[PDB]
Amino acid sequence: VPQELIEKIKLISPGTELRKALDDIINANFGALIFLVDDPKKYEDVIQGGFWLDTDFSAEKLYELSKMDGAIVLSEDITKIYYANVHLVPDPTIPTGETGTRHRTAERLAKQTGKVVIAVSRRRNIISLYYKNYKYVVNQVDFLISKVTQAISTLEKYKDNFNKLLSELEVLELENRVTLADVVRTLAKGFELLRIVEEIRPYIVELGEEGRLARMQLRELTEDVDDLLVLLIMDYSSEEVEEETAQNILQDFITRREPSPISISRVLGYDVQQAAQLDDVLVSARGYRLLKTVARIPLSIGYNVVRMFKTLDQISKASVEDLKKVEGIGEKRARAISESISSLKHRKT
Amino acid sequence: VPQELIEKIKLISPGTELRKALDDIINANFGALIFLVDDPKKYEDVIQGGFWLDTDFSAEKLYELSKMDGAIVLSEDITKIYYANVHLVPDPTIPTGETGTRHRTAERLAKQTGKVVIAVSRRRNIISLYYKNYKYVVNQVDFLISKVTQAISTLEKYKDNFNKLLSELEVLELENRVTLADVVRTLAKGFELLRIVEEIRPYIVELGEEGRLARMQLRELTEDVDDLLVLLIMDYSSEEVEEETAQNILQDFITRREPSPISISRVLGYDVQQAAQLDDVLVSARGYRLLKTVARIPLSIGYNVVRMFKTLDQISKASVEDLKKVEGIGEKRARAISESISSLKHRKT
Numbered sequence: 137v138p139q140e141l142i143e144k145i146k147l148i149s150p151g152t153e154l155r156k157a158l159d160d161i162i163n164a165n166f167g168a169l170i171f172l173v174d175d176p177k178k179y180e181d182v183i184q185g186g187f188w189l190d191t192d193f194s195a196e197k198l199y200e201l202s203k204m205d206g207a208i209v210l211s212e213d214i215t216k217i218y219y220a221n222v223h224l225v226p227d228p229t230i231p232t233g234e235t236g237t238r239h240r241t242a243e244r245l246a247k248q249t250g251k252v253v254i255a256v257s258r259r260r261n262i263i264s265l266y267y268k269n270y271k272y273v274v275n276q277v278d279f280l281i282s283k284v285t286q287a288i289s290t291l292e293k294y295k296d297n298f299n300k301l302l303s304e305l306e307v308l309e310l311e312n313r314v315t316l317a318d319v320v321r322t323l324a325k326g327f328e329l330l331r332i333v334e335e336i337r338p339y340i341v342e343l344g345e346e347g348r349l350a351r352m353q354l355r356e357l358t359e360d361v362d363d364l365l366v367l368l369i370m371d372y373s374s375e376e377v378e379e380e381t382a383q384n385i386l387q388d389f390i391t392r393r394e395p396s397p398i399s400i401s402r403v404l405g406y407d408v409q410q411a412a413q414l415d416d417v418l419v420s421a422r423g424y425r426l427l428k429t430v431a432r433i434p435l436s437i438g439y440n441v442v443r444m445f446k447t448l449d450q451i452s453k454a455s456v457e458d459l460k461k462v463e464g465i466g467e468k469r470a471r472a473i474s475e476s477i478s479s480l481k482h483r484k485t
Numbered sequence: 486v487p488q489e490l491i492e493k494i495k496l497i498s499p500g501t502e503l504r505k506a507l508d509d510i511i512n513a514n515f516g517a518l519i520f521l522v523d524d525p526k527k528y529e530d531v532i533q534g535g536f537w538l539d540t541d542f543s544a545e546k547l548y549e550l551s552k553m554d555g556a557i558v559l560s561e562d563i564t565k566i567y568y569a570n571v572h573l574v575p576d577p578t579i580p581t582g583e584t585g586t587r588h589r590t591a592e593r594l595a596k597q598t599g600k601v602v603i604a605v606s607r608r609r610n611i612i613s614l615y616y617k618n619y620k621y622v623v624n625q626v627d628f629l630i631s632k633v634t635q636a637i638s639t640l641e642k643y644k645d646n647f648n649k650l651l652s653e654l655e656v657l658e659l660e661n662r663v664t665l666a667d668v669v670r671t672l673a674k675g676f677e678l679l680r681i682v683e684e685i686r687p688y689i690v691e692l693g694e695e696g697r698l699a700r701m702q703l704r705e706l707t708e709d710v711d712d713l714l715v716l717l718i719m720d721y722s723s724e725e726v727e728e729e730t731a732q733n734i735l736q737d738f739i740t741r742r743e744p745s746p747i748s749i750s751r752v753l754g755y756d757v758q759q760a761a762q763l764d765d766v767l768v769s770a771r772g773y774r775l776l777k778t779v780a781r782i783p784l785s786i787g788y789n790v791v792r793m794f795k796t797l798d799q800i801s802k803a804s805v806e807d808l809k810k811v812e813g814i815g816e817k818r819a820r821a822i823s824e825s826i827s828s829l830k831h832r833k834t
């Protein structure tokens with residue numbers, strides 16, 4: 137959905153006075169055909185008859201005017217009502233796949249002038265917005281809320297399985313018994329989880345102000361998942377990898393590439409052709425995840441720590457004095473690192 | 486019914502563009518509250534909100550605008566539509582005998598402003614017109630046509646009886662055997678016939694263009710009745726009476742006074758007590774009726790003939806030579822008088 141169309145869709149999203157008027161119109165089963173233009177004079181060839189109003193916009197005014205047949209013309213910023221009861225006459229030769237005089241008119245006029253035209257039939261509860269060559273059907277809140285609520289419920293389920301996988305991976309990581317299969321399984325679940333978020337995004341945007349709670353729920357459920365996934369990529373990829381490369385790996389699996397076991401392992405730098413092989417590849421975390429998340433060690437400085445020790449296992453075998461031999465690590469960083477790892481190994485294993 | 490009010494009625498009578506619109510409004514069961522003013526700027530105290538239109542009036546525009554709630558404001562000559570969807574706020578203290586917000590509003594505004602206010606309820610088919618302290622309910626054509634058709638059919642009956650009484654009196658006149666009862670009976674039916682005409686007149690006016698055939702029918706039926714009644718009064722009044730005085734006698738019995746036997750005989754100049762005495766009084770026609778309607782002799786000249794011969798009876802016995810001794814009667818008029826009378830006697834008696 138082009139950013140261009142997205143901007144127009146906001147004009148009729150829950151929260152706007154315009155949308156408030158369209159909802160009333162739908163609730164009353166009145167129909168509507170609205171043409172948005174800033175300079176009516178320039179479009180006098182497509183606008184016939186009706187009443188010249190040139191008055192300040194209001195949702196109540198639009199609703200009342202919609203009781204009359206014909207079309208209403210508003211300024212593009214929806215601050216002025218120019219005409220009411222007009223006959224819109226776009227070029228008949230313009231191709232259109234719409235049905236009925238009202239929708240065929242709206243599409244042709246939108247294509248012809250490059251402006252927005254809103255159509256609402258009396259029988260249905262949807263709002264059809266035509267811009268240029270785009271057509272976007274806007275749904276009622278009830279339909280959206282239902283879809284969004286089910287998606288959120290679905291996400292809770294994915295997140296729960298994700299936390300179960302992560303907790304088990306945590307134990308293995310601390311015991312240095314991690315296999316490629318363990319990592320791949322955790323990443324795949326994390327990728328699948330973030331995909332759902334991406335897919336439900338448009339519904340939430342279309343919800344406008346009625347999507348505030350939904351946004352809060354999504355944020356609470358996926359708060360630190362992206363970072364966590366990036367750190368897993370950095371900790372288990374075949375060879376050293378930057379936070380940028382990892383972040384890119386994440387974006388690829390959430391959209392383009394499909395999160396399949398082999399595909400994920402392959403992108404991580406492992407040469408595998410069968411899923412069964414995964415349980416045969418032993419891997420060791422570099423330590424980035426634990427250093428940043430638990431030890432609260434900045435990634436930049438973390439590269440230094442991994443530079444010297446290579447793996448979390450070797451980092452947990454170092455002492456305060458030993459750890460301080462790394463640039464950026466003082467008695468404080470050294471303590472945080474050492475104490476945080478030792479504490480986890482005692483509580484988790 | 487005041488003339489200043491009859492003028493306003495014409496504004497919504499069948500045939501006008503305004504009435505065409507109101508008929509449609511009624512057919513669609515839309516309601517209507519129309520305010521007719523000349524200077525829109527001067528009523529900012531009773532007119533609130535709505536849309537300023539200042540556009541040319543048309544029946545279709547009014548109809549379309551009546552779909553919205555509220556009132557419409559038109560110019561007094563029905564050439565412009567000033568406002569639509571407005572809230573009318575007349576003084577609440579002004580007395581009103583109307584029921585419902587719309588009609589109470591209409592009567593108050595008309596009284597407060599001295600202007601015309603038209604109200605139409607959604608459920609009923611009558612147009613209520615308010616002007617100053619007047620209220621006139623206009624009916625649909627179908628209701629008016631039924632009443633008018635009945636009245637005409639009734640007039641046909643009275644006219645048929647008038648014609649029979651007239652032919653009977655004609656015989657009696659030619660034979661000089663007329664009694665006051667015969668005269669009064671004929672005049673009575675003639676006064677009753679013209680009264681019916683007077684009572685149906687407002688129905689005819691209210692029919693507007695749709696009353697053309699009705700008017701033609703009333704004219705054909707009562708054509709020369711008035712003249713005939715005036716001539717009878719002149720021929721049978723106790724003492725010589727001027728035409729104007731006869732016409733005034735007619736006007737009175739057609740509106741004010743009641744055409745009862747004794748009453749008519751009284752006004753004719755005969756001192757009668759009981760209606761049974763009428764058959765006892767013998768009277769002789771002066772001759773005006775026959776001289777003017779049959780001999781085509783102007784009243785100014787007929788006076789001369791009566792002045793000399795005194796009665797139709799004597800006139801019928803006068804020779805051409807005798808008649809030519811009268812001022813205004815030459816060989817031509819003498820022949821016409823003599824021949825027209827001898828012809829009637831031969832044919833009728």
Ligand SMILES: Nc1ncnc2c1ncn2[C@@H]1O[C@@H]2COP(=O)(O)O[C@H]3[C@@H](O)[C@H](n4cnc5c(N)ncnc54)O[C@@H]3COP(=O)(O)O[C@H]2[C@H]1O
Nearest residue numbers: 516518553554555556571572573574575585586587588590
């Ligand atoms: N001051 C008041 N006191 C008690 N009830 C009140 C009221 N004001 C409004 N209402 C109630 O609301 C109903 C509908 O109001 P509405 O404006 O839609 O629909 C109205 C309106 O479009 C028109 N109308 C009435 N008075 C008007 C006024 N002063 N100015 C402009 N339009 C008026 O006639 C329609 C029907 O009138 P109706 O009385 O049958 O129906 C009224 C009445 O039952």
